[PDB]
mmCIF file of C-alpha atoms in Angstrom:
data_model
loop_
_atom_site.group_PDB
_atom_site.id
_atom_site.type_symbol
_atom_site.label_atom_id
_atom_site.label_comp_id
_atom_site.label_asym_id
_atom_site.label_seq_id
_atom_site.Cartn_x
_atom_site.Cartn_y
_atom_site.Cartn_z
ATOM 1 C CA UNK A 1 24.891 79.581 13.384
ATOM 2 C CA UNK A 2 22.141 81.899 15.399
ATOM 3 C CA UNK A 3 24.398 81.642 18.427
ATOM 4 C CA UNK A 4 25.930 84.899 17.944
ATOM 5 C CA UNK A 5 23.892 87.526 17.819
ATOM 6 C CA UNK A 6 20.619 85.762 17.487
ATOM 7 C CA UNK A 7 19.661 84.503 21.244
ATOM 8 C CA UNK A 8 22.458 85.427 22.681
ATOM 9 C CA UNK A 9 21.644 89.288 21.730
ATOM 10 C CA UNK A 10 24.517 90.944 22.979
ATOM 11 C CA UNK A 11 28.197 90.522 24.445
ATOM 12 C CA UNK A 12 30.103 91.024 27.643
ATOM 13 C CA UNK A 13 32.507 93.278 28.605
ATOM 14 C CA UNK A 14 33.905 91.703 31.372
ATOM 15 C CA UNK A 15 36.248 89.234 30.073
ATOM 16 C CA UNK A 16 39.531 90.631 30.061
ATOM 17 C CA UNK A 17 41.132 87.164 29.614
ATOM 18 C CA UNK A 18 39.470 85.941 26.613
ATOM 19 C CA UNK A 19 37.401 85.408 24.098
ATOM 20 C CA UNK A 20 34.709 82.653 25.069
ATOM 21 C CA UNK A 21 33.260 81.590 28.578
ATOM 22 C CA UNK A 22 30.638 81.568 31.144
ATOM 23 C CA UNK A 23 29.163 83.787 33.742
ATOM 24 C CA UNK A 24 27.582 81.989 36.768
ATOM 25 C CA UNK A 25 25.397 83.339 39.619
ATOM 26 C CA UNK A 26 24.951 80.397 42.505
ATOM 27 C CA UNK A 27 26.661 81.714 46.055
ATOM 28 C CA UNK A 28 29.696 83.472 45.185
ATOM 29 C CA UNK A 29 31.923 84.645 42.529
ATOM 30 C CA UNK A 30 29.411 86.971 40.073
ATOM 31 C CA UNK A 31 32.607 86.755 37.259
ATOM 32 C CA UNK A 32 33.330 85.886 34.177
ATOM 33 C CA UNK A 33 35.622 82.717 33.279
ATOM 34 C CA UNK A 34 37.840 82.427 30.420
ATOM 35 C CA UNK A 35 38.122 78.895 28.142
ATOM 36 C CA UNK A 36 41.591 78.766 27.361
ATOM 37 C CA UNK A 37 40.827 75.455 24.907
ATOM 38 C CA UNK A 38 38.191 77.124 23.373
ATOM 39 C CA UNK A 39 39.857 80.232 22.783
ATOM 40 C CA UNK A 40 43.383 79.129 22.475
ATOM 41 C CA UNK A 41 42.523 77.049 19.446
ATOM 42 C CA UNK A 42 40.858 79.864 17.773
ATOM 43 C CA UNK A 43 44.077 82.250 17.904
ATOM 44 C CA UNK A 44 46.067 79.476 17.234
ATOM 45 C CA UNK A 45 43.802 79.161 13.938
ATOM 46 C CA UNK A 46 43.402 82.619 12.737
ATOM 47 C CA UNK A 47 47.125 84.011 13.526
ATOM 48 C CA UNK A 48 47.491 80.828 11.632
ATOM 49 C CA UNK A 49 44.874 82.681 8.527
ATOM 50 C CA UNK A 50 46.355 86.044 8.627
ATOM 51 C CA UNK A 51 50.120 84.592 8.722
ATOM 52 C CA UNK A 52 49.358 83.128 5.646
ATOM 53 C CA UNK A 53 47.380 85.434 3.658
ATOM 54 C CA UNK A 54 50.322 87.744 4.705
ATOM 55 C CA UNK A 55 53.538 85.217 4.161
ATOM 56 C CA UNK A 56 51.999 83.146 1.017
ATOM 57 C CA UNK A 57 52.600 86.247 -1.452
ATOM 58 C CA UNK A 58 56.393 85.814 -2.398
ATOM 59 C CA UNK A 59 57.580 88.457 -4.515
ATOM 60 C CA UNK A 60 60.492 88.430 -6.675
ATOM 61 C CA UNK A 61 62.779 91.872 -7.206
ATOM 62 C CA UNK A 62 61.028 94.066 -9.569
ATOM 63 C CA UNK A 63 61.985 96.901 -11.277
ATOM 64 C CA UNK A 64 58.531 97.866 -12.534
ATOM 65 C CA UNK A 65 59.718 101.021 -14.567
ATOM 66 C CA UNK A 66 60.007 101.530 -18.443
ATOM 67 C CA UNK A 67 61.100 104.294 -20.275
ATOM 68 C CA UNK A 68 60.175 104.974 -24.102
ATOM 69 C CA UNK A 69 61.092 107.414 -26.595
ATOM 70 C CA UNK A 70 58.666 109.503 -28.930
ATOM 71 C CA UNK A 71 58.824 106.442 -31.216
ATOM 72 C CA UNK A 72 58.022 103.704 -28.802
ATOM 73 C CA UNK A 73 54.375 104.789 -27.553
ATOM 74 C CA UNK A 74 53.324 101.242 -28.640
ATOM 75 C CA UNK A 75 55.550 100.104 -25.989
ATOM 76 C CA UNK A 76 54.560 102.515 -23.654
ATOM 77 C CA UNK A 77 50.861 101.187 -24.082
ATOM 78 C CA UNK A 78 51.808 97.850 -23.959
ATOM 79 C CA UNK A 79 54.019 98.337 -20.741
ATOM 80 C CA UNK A 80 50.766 100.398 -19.083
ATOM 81 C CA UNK A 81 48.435 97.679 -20.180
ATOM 82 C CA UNK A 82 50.351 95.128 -17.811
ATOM 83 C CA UNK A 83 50.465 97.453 -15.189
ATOM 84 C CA UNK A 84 46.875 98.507 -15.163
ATOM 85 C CA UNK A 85 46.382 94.317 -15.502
ATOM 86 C CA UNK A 86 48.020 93.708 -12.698
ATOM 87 C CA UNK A 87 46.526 96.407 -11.181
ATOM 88 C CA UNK A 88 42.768 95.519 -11.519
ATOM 89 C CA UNK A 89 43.479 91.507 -11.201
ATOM 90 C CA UNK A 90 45.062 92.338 -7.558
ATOM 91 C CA UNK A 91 42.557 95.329 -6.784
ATOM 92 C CA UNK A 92 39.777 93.107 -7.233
ATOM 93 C CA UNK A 93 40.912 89.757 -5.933
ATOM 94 C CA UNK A 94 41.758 91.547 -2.777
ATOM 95 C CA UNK A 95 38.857 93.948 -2.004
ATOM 96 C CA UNK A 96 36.842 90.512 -2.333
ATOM 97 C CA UNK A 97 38.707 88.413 -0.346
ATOM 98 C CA UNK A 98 39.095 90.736 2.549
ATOM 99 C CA UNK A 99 35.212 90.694 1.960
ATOM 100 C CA UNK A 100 34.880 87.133 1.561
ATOM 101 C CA UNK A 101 37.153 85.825 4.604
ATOM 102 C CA UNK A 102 35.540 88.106 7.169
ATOM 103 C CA UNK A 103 32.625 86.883 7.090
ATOM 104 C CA UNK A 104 34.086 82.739 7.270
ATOM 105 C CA UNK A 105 36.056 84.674 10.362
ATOM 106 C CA UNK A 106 32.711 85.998 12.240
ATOM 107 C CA UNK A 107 30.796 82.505 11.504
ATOM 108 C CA UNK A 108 33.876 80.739 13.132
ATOM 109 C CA UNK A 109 32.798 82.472 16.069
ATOM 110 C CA UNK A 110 29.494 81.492 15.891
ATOM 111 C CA UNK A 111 30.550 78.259 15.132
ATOM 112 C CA UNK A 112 32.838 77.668 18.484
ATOM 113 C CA UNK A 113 30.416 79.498 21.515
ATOM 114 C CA UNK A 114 27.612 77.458 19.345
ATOM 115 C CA UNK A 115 29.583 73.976 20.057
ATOM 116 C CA UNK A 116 30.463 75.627 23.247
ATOM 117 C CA UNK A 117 26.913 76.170 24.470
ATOM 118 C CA UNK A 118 26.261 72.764 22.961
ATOM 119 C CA UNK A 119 29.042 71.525 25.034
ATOM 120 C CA UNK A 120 27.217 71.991 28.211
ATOM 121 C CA UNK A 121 23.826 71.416 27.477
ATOM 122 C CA UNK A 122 24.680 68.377 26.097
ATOM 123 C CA UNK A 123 26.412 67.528 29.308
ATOM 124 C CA UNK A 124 23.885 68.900 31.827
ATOM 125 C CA UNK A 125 20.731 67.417 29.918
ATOM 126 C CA UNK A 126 17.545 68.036 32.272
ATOM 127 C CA UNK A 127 19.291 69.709 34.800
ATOM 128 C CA UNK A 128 18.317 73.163 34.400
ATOM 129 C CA UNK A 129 15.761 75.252 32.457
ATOM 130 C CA UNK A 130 17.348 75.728 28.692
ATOM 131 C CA UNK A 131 16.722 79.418 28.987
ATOM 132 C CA UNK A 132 16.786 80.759 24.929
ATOM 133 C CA UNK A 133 19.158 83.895 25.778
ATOM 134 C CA UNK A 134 22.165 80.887 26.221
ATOM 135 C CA UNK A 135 21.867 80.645 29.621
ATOM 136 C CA UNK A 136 20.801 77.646 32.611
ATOM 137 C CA UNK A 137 18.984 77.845 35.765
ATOM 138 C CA UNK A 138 20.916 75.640 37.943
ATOM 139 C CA UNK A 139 18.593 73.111 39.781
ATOM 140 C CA UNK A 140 21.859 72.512 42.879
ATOM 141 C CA UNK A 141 23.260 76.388 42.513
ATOM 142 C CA UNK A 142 26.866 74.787 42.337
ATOM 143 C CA UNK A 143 29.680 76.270 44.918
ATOM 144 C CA UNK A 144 33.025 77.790 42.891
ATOM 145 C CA UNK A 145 34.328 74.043 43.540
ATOM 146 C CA UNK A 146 32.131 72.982 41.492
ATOM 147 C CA UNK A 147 31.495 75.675 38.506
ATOM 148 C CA UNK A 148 35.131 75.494 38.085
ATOM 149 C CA UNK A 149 34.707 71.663 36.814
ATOM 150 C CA UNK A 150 31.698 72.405 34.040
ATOM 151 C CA UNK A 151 34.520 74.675 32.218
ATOM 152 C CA UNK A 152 36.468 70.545 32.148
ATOM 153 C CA UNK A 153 32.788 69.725 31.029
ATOM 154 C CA UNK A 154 32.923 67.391 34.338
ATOM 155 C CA UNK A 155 29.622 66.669 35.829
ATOM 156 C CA UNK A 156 27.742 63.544 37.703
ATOM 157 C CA UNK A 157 24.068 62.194 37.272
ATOM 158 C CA UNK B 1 67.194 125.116 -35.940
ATOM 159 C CA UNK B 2 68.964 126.465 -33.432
ATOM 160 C CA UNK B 3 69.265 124.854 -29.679
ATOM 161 C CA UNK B 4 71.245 126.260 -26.889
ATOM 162 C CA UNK B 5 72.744 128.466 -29.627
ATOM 163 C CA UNK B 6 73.682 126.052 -31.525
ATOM 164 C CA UNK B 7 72.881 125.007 -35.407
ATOM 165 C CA UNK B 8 75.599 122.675 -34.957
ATOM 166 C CA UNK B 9 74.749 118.850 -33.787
ATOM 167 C CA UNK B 10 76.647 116.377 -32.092
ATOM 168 C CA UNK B 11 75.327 112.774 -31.992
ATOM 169 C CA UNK B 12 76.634 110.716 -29.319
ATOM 170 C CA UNK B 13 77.033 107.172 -29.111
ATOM 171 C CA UNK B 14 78.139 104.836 -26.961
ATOM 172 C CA UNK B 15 79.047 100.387 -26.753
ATOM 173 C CA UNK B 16 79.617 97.977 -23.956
ATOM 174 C CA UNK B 17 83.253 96.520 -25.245
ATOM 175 C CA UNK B 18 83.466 93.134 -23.473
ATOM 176 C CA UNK B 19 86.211 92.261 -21.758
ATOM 177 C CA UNK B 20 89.097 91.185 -23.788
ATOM 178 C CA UNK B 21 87.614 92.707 -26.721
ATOM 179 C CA UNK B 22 89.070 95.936 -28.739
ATOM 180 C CA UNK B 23 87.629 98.582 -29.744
ATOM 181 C CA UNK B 24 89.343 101.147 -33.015
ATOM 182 C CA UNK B 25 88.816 104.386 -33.871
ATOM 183 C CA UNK B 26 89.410 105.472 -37.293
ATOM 184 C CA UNK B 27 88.655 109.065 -38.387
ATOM 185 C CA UNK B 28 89.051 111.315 -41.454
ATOM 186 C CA UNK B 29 87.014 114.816 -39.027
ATOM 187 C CA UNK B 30 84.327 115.300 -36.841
ATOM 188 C CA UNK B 31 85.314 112.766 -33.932
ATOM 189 C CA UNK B 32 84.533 113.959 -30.576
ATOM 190 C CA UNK B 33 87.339 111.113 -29.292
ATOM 191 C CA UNK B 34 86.776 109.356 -25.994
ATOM 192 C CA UNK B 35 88.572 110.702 -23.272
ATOM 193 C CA UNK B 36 87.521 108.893 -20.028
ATOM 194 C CA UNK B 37 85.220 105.614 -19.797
ATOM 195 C CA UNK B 38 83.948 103.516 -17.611
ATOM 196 C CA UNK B 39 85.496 99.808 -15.934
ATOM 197 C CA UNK B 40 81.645 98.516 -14.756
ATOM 198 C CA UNK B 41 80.036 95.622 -13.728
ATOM 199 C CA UNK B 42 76.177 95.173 -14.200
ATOM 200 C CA UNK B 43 74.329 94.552 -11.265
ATOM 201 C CA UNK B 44 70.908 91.884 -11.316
ATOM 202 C CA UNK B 45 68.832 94.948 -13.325
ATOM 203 C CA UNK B 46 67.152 97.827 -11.457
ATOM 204 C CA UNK B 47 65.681 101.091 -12.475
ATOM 205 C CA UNK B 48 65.591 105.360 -12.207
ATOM 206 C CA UNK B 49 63.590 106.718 -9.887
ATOM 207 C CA UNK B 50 62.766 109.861 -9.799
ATOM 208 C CA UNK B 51 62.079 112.308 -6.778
ATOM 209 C CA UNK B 52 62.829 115.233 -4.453
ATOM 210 C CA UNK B 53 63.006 112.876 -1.121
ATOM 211 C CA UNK B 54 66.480 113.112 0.586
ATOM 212 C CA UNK B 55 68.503 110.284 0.531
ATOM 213 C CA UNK C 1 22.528 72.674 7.727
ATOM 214 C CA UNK C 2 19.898 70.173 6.644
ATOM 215 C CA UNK C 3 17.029 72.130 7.099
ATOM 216 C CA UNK C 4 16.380 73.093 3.368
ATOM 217 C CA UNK C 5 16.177 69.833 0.936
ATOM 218 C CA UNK C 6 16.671 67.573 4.666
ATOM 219 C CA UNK C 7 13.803 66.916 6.761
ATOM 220 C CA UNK C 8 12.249 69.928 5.756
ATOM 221 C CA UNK C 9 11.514 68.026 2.016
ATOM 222 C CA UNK C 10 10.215 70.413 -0.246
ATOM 223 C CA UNK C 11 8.865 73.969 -0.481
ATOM 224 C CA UNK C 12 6.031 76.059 -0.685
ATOM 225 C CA UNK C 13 4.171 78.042 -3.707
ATOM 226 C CA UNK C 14 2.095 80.202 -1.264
ATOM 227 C CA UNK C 15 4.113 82.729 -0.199
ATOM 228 C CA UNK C 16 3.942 85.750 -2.990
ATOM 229 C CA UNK C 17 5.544 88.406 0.163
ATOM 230 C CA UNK C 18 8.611 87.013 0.945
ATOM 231 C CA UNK C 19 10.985 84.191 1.338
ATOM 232 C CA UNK C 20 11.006 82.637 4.753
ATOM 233 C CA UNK C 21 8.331 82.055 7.106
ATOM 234 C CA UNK C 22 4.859 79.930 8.374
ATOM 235 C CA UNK C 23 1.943 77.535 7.419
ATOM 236 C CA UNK C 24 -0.558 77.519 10.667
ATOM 237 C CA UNK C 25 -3.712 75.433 10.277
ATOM 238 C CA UNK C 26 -6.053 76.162 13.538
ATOM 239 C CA UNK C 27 -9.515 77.278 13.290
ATOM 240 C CA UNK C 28 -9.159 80.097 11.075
ATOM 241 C CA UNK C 29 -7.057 81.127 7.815
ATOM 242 C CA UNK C 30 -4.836 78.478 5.874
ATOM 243 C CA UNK C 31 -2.581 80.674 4.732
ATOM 244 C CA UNK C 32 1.381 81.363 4.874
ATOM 245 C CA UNK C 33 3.485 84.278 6.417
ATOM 246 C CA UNK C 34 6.410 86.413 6.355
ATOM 247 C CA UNK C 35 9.191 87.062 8.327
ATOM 248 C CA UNK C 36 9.601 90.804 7.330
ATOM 249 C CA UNK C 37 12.962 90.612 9.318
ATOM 250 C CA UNK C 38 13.854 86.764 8.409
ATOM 251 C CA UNK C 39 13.075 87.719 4.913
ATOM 252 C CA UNK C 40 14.676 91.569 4.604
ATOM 253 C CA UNK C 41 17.639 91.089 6.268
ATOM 254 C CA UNK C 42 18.437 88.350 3.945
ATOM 255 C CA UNK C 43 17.832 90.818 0.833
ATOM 256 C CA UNK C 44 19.818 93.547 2.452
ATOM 257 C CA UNK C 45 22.461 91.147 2.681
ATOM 258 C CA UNK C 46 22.229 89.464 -0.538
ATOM 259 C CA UNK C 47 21.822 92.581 -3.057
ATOM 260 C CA UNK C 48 24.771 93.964 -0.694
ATOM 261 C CA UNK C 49 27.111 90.865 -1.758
ATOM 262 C CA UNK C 50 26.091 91.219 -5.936
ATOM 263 C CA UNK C 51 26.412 94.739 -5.935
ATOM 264 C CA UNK C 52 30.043 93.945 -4.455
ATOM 265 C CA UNK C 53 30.886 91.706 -6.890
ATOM 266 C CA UNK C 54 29.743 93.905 -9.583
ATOM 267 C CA UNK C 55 30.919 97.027 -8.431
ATOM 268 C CA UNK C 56 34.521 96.400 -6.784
ATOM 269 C CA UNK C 57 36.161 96.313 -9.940
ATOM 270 C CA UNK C 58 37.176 99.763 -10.927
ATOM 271 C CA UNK C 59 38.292 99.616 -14.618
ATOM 272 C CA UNK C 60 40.363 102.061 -16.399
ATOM 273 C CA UNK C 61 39.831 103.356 -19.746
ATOM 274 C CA UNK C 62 41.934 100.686 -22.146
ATOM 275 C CA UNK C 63 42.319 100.388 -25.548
ATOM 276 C CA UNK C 64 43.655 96.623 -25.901
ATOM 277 C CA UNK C 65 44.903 96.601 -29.552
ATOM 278 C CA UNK C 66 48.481 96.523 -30.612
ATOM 279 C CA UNK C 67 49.443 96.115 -34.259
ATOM 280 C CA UNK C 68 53.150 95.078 -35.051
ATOM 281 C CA UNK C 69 54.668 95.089 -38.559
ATOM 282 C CA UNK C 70 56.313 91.961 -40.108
ATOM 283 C CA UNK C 71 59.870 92.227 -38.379
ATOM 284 C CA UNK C 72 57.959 93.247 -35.024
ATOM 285 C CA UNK C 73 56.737 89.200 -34.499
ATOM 286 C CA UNK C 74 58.366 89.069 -31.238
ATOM 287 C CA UNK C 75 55.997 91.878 -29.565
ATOM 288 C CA UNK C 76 52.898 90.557 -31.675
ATOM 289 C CA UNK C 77 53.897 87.144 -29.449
ATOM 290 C CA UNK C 78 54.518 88.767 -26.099
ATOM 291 C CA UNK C 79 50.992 91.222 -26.702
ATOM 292 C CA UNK C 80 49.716 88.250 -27.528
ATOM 293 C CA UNK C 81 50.885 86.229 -24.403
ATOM 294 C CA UNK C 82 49.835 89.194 -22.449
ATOM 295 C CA UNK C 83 46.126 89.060 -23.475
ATOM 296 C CA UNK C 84 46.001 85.239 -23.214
ATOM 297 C CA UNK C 85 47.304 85.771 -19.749
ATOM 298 C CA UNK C 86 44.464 87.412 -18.159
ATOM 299 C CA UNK C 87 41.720 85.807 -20.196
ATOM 300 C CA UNK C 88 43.215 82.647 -18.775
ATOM 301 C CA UNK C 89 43.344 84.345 -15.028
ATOM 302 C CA UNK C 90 39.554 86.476 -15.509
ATOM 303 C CA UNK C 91 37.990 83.074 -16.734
ATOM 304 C CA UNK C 92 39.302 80.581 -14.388
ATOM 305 C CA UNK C 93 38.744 82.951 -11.198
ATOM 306 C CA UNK C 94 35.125 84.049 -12.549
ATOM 307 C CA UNK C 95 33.499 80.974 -13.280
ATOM 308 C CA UNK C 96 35.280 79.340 -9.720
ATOM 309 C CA UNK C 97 33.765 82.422 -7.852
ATOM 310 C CA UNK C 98 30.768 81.879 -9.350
ATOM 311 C CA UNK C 99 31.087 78.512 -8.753
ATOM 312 C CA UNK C 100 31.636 78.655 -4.545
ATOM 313 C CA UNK C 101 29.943 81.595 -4.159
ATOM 314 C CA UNK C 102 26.338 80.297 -4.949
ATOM 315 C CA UNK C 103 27.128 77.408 -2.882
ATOM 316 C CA UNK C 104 27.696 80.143 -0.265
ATOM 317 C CA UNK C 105 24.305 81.840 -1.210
ATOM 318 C CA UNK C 106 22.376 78.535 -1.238
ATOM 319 C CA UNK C 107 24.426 77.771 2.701
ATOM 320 C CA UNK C 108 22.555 81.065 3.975
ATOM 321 C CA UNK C 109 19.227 80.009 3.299
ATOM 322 C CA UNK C 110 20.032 76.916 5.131
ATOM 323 C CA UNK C 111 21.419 78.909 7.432
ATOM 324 C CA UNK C 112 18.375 81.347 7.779
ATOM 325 C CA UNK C 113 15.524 78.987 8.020
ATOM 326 C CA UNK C 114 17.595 76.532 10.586
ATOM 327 C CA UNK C 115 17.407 79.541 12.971
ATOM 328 C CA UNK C 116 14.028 80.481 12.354
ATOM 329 C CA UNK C 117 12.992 76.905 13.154
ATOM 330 C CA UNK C 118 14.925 77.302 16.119
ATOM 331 C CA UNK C 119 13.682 80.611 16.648
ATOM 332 C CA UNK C 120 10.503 78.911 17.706
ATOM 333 C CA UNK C 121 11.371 75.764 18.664
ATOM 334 C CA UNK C 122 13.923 77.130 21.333
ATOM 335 C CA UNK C 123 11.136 79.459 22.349
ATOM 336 C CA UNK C 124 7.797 76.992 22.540
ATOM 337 C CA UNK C 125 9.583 74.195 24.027
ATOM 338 C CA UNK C 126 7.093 71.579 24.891
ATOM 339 C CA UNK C 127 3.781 72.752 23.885
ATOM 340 C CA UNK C 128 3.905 70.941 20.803
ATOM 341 C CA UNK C 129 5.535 67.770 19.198
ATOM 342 C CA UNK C 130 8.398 68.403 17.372
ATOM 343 C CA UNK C 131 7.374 66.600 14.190
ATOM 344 C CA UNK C 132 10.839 65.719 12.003
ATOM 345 C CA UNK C 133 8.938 67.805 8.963
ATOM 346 C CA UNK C 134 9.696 71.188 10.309
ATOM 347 C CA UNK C 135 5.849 71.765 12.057
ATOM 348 C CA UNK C 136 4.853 71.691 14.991
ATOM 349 C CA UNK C 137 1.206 70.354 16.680
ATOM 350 C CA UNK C 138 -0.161 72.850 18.897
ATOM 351 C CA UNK C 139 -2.144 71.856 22.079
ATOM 352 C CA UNK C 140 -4.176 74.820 22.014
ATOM 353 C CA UNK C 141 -4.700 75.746 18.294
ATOM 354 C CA UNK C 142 -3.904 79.425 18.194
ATOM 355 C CA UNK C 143 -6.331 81.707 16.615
ATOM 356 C CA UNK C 144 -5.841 84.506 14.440
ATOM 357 C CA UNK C 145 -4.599 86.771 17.390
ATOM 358 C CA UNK C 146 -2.084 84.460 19.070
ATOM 359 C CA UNK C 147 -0.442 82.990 15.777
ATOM 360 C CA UNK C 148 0.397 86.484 14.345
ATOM 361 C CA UNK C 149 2.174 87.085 17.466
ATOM 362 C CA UNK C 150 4.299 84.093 17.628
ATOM 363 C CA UNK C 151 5.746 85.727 14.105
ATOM 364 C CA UNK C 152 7.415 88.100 16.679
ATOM 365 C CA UNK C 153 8.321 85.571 18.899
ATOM 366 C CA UNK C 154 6.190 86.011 21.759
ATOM 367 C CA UNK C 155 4.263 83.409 23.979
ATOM 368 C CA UNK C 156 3.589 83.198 27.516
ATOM 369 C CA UNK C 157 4.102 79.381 29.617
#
């Protein structure tokens, strides 16, 4: 979506815990909070990607050597024609999906903080100003007791 | 021509006799006889590689 | 998403500058705009993704012919498997890129336009009704000078 980099600009630093959350400023704690459902599904999905782009090649032994004499260079040919094959079929396929599967990986992330934005605002409805930079003016400038239970998505009228 | 000094040739041969199987040699000259071979058992199928990395 | 070919119908013939942007009907000029950033980061992105496609396969210099006399059938057959082989791999991988990839291409416009709605909607809020079309009824009909300037995203209440 236009979640990442598109009204919410930039990033924050200050999140040594993980990778998606919320930053509140009411009558105390100025931090940063993690959401460990958010974010633990998303390394549980793409350590799920990479272990399988990784562990879905099997690969038989191989000897890929060949050795011709001065009669054989037909051989020879033949036997560098498969390599160079092989070669440009796995050169290619690779560069592109590298290429291809990076991008699907940075749209996931616009995909979760977009359903994670979403997962507030349509909780707390008309209950703050919907500020475009992805970010609420509280109308009852919750206490940490409080703040603590939007990350549960737990709210009241 | 000669090579390594030599206008002479020797062509060298060589067969995989099974096991069981006989092999004869029957010669009227020029038989460079076997001395020593080789009891071997071929492996799943590899390769040469060549290099000046220590093992 | 189902901005293009959804509730915003069909398109528009006007726009001879670019790809993406308004249709304002005020008190002064009918006519349609571009987003020179909408519009030119989508070209910088798409002539970045065909000239990757085109240009990340390196190709060695090949000559693919192999001729085999009459008591050389078996290599004639294996050649001949070889060939087959990657015609078989090339074709099927080609036309199935081809195939997802323009789906892909077709997604980003979708993609685009969705957050250029958004980019204004999420920015006027409720100074206009948010007719299902993709257009929006102003209460005070911008002129000339205020309408160019909401192309840059800038209002005031």
């Amino acid at each position: 979506f236009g979640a990442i980099a598109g009204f919410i600009e930039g990033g924050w630093t200050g999140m040594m815990d993980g990778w998606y959350g919320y930053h509140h400023q009411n009558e105390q704690g100025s931090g940063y909070a993690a959401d460990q459902k958010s974010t633990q599904n998303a390394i549980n999905g793409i350590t799920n990607k990479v272990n399988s782009v990784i562990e879905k090649m099997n690969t038989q032994f191989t000897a890929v050597g060949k050795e011709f004499n001065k009669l054989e260079k037909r051989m020879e040919n033949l036997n560098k024609k498969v390599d160079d094959g092989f070669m440009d079929i796995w050169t290619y396929n690779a560069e592109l999906l590298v290429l291809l599967e990076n991008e699907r990986t940075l749209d996931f992330h616009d995909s979760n903080v977009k359903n994670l934005y979403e997962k507030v605002k349509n909780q707390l409805r008309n209950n703050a100003k919907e500020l475009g930079n992805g970010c609420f003016e509280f109308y009852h400038k919750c206490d940490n007791e409080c703040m603590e239970s939007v990350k549960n998505g737990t709210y009241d009228y | 021509p000669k090579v390594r000094d030599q206008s002479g040739r020797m062509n060298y041969y060589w067969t995989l006799l099974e096991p069981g199987d006989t092999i004869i040699f029957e010669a009227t000259g020029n038989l460079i006889a076997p001395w020593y071979a080789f009891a071997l058992s071929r492996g799943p199928g590899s390769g040469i590689i060549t290099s000046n990395a220590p093992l």
